Scaffold this active site. Structure first.
Site, PDB file in Angstrom:
ATOM      1  N   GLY A  28       0.766  -1.237   0.000  1.00  0.00           N
ATOM      2  CA  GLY A  28       0.000   0.000   0.000  1.00  0.00           C
ATOM      3  C   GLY A  28       0.799   1.289   0.000  1.00  0.00           C
ATOM      4  O   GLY A  28       1.788   1.417   0.720  1.00  0.00           O
ATOM      5  N   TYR A  29       0.702  10.075   3.881  1.00  0.00           N
ATOM      6  CA  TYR A  29       0.475   9.185   5.016  1.00  0.00           C
ATOM      7  C   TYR A  29       1.699   8.304   5.275  1.00  0.00           C
ATOM      8  O   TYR A  29       2.429   8.501   6.252  1.00  0.00           O
ATOM      9  CB  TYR A  29      -0.761   8.316   4.768  1.00  0.00           C
ATOM     10  N   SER A  31       4.024   4.494   3.537  1.00  0.00           N
ATOM     11  CA  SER A  31       4.105   3.291   2.726  1.00  0.00           C
ATOM     12  C   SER A  31       4.119   2.079   3.647  1.00  0.00           C
ATOM     13  O   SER A  31       4.687   2.125   4.742  1.00  0.00           O
ATOM     14  CB  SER A  31       5.384   3.284   1.883  1.00  0.00           C
ATOM     15  OG  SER A  31       5.732   4.594   1.454  1.00  0.00           O
ATOM     16  N   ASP A 160      -7.150   2.237  13.163  1.00  0.00           N
ATOM     17  CA  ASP A 160      -7.261   3.511  12.443  1.00  0.00           C
ATOM     18  C   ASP A 160      -8.014   4.570  13.252  1.00  0.00           C
ATOM     19  O   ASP A 160      -9.025   5.127  12.819  1.00  0.00           O
ATOM     20  CB  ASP A 160      -7.888   3.331  11.054  1.00  0.00           C
ATOM     21  CG  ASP A 160      -6.876   2.975   9.985  1.00  0.00           C
ATOM     22  OD1 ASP A 160      -5.687   2.789  10.312  1.00  0.00           O
ATOM     23  OD2 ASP A 160      -7.282   2.908   8.806  1.00  0.00           O
TER      24      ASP A 160
HETATM   25  O1  SRJ Z   1      -1.692   2.766   9.472  1.00  0.00           O
HETATM   26  C1  SRJ Z   1      -1.365   1.445   9.091  1.00  0.00           C
HETATM   27  C2  SRJ Z   1      -0.381   0.843  10.096  1.00  0.00           C
HETATM   28  C3  SRJ Z   1       0.552  -0.127   9.686  1.00  0.00           C
HETATM   29  C4  SRJ Z   1       1.487  -0.656  10.603  1.00  0.00           C
HETATM   30  C5  SRJ Z   1       1.475  -0.207  11.919  1.00  0.00           C
HETATM   31  C6  SRJ Z   1       0.543   0.755  12.321  1.00  0.00           C
HETATM   32  C7  SRJ Z   1      -0.384   1.275  11.420  1.00  0.00           C
HETATM   33  C8  SRJ Z   1      -2.741   0.684   9.058  1.00  0.00           C
HETATM   34  N1  SRJ Z   1      -2.481  -0.742   8.633  1.00  0.00           N
HETATM   35  C9  SRJ Z   1      -2.737  -1.698   9.755  1.00  0.00           C
HETATM   36  C10 SRJ Z   1      -2.230  -3.097   9.425  1.00  0.00           C
HETATM   37  C11 SRJ Z   1      -2.662  -4.212  10.358  1.00  0.00           C
HETATM   38  C12 SRJ Z   1      -3.207  -4.169   8.956  1.00  0.00           C
HETATM   39  C13 SRJ Z   1      -3.258  -1.101   7.400  1.00  0.00           C
HETATM   40  C14 SRJ Z   1      -2.820  -0.159   6.260  1.00  0.00           C
HETATM   41  C15 SRJ Z   1      -3.178   1.291   6.618  1.00  0.00           C
HETATM   42  C16 SRJ Z   1      -3.745   1.342   8.053  1.00  0.00           C
HETATM   43  O2  SRJ Z   1      -4.013   2.682   8.311  1.00  0.00           O
HETATM   44  C17 SRJ Z   1      -5.056   0.510   8.092  1.00  0.00           C
HETATM   45  C18 SRJ Z   1      -4.774  -0.925   7.628  1.00  0.00           C
HETATM   46 MG    MG Z   2      -9.005   3.027   7.605  1.00  0.00          MG
END
Ligand code: SRJ
Ligand code: MG
Ligand code: CL
Ligand code: CL
Ligand code: CL
Ligand code: CL
Ligand code: CL
Length: 342
Positions: A28, A29, A31, A160
Site C-alpha cells: 500500500g 500518510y 508506505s 485507524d
Molecule cells: O496505518 C497502518 C499501520 C501499519 C502498521 C502499523 C501501524 C499502522 C494501518 N495498517 C494496519 C495493518 C494491520 C493491517 C493497514 C494499512 C493502513 C492502516 O491505516 C489501516 C490498515
Molecule cells: Mg481506515
C-alpha cells in the site's frame, strides 16, 4: 544492543530495517509492506512514515500516533509490536517505522450470510474494545466497517483511530455515513458518545445488509436521520450552540420517532431494543459501552470478569505549544524507550 539493519529499495522507496524482518512485499500518510518477523513468528505490517517532521502540525501528529499506539494493550484493539529508527542519535534522526500484526480482511470483506449469533459476537467485541478505549478518555471518532479487522474465526480488532478534511466528507461517501449528527454538523462540543452512534449504524447494517443513513450530502443525511429518530425537542435544541444551526433545525416540519420493529423487520427483539438505546439524537441519553455489555442481547458472551479497562492516559501534550525540533525530540524519546510485549 542495537540490531543490525539492512537496506533495500522497493517500489522507489528505501527501506532500512532490522534483520529480523524478512521477505518484505509492498501492499500500500506512509508506505506499508508485509513481512515475516523471525523473532515472533508473526506475519506483520511495517509502515514507514512519510515526512514525519515536515511541519509543526505533522510533527505533533507523528508524536500523537506513537503515544496512542504505545498505550493500546487489548485483544480487540490494534497494538504495537515494534517501533524503530535506523538513526544512531537524535542528530541523525529522520525516519520512523511502525510494526503491527498483519490483518487481511475488514468487516466489508466479511459482510457472508450472517446469523444473529454472528451479529452478537461482532458487536460484543466492538463494545468490549470501546469500553477499554473510553476508560482512558480516548475518543476513536472514525468507527466504520473499513476500520474493523476480522479473521476467519470471527475475531475482531478496532484500528485507524482518528488522528479528515472537508472534501473527504463531501457527497455520497462512506466517510460520513457513520458519523454522529452533532459532529457532522458541528452542533456542539462532542465527546465519547459519538462512538456509540457509529456502533448503532454498524449493527443496523449487519442486520439488514444495507447502509442505515446513506446520504448524498450532509443535509440529505440529516433528513434520513431525523425521519428515523424524530426531530429534536426544546431540551436538545438548547444544547446546540450555533444560532444558525438551531434556526435551520426549526425550519423542518416536526416528525415522531419511528417504530424500530417495523424498520428492522424480523430482527431479534433484543437487537431492536439495543438499537433504540444507541440511536438516540441527544448524546447525553445514549447507552454507554459499559452499560451495553450488560444488555441481554449479549447474554451468551458477557463476562464482567473478562472485560478489562485501560491504564490512565495523559493527553496534556494536546494543549501544549512546541517547536518542530521539540516534538521531534519527544518522538525520539518514545522510540528508544519502547518495550515489546511478552
Ligand atoms: O496505518 C497502518 C499501520 C501499519 C502498521 C502499523 C501501524 C499502522 C494501518 N495498517 C494496519 C495493518 C494491520 C493491517 C493497514 C494499512 C493502513 C492502516 O491505516 C489501516 C490498515
Ligand atoms: Mg481506515
Ligand atoms: Cl534483528
Ligand atoms: Cl533515520
Ligand atoms: Cl467503511
Ligand atoms: Cl411541523
Ligand atoms: Cl500516560
Amino acid at each position: 544492543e542495537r540490531p543490525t539493519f539492512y537496506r533495500q529499495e522497493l517500489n522507489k522507496t528505501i527501506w532500512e530495517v532490522p534483520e529480523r524482518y524478512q521477505n518484505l512485499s509492498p501492499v500500500g500518510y506512509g508506505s506499508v509492506c508485509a513481512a515475516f518477523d523471525t523473532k515472533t513468528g508473526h506475519r506483520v505490517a511495517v509502515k514507514k512514515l512519510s515526512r514525519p517532521f515536515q511541519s509543526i502540525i505533522h510533527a505533533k501528529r507523528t508524536y500523537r500516533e506513537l503515544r496512542l499506539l504505545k498505550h493500546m494493550k487489548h485483544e480487540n484493539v490494534i497494538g504495537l509490536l515494534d517501533v524503530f529508527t535506523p538513526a544512531r542519535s537524535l542528530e541523525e534522526f529522520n525516519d520512523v517505522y511502525l510494526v503491527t500484526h498483519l490483518m487481511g480482511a475488514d468487516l466489508n470483506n466479511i459482510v457472508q450470510k450472517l446469523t444473529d449469533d454472528h451479529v452478537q459476537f461482532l458487536i460484543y467485541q466492538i463494545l468490549r474494545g470501546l469500553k477499554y478505549i473510553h476508560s482512558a478518555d480516548i475518543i476513536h471518532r472514525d468507527l466504520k466497517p473499513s476500520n474493523l479487522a476480522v479473521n476467519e474465526d470471527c475475531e475482531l480488532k478496532i484500528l485507524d483511530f482518528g488522528l479528515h478534511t472537508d472534501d473527504e466528507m463531501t457527497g455520497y461517501v462512506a466517510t460520513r455515513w457513520y458519523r454522529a449528527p452533532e459532529i457532522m454538523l458541528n452542533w456542539m462540543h462532542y465527546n465519547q458518545t459519538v462512538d456509540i452512534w457509529s456502533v448503532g449504524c454498524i449493527m443496523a447494517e449487519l442486520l439488514t445488509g444495507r447502509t442505515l443513513f446513506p446520504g448524498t450530502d450532509h443535509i440529505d443525511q440529516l433528513k434520513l436521520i431525523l425521519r428515523l429518530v424524530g426531530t429534536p425537542g426544546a431540551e436538545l435544541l438548547k444544547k446546540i450552540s450555533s444560532e444558525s444551526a438551531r434556526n435551520y433545525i426549526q425550519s423542518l416540519a416536526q416528525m415522531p420517532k419511528m417504530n424500530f420493529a417495523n424498520v428492522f423487520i424480523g430482527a431479534n427483539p433484543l437487537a431492536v431494543d439495543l438499537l433504540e438505546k444507541m440511536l438516540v439524537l441527544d448524546s447525553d441519553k445514549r447507552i454507554t459501552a459499559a452499560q451495553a455489555l450488560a444488555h441481554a442481547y449479549f447474554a451468551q458472551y458477557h463476562d464482567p470478569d473478562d472485560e478489562p479497562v485501560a491504564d490512565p492516559y495523559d493527553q496534556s501534550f494536546e494543549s501544549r505549544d512546541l517547536l518542530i525540533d521539540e516534538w521531534k525530540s519527544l518522538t525520539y524519546d518514545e522510540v528508544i524507550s519502547f518495550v515489546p510485549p511478552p
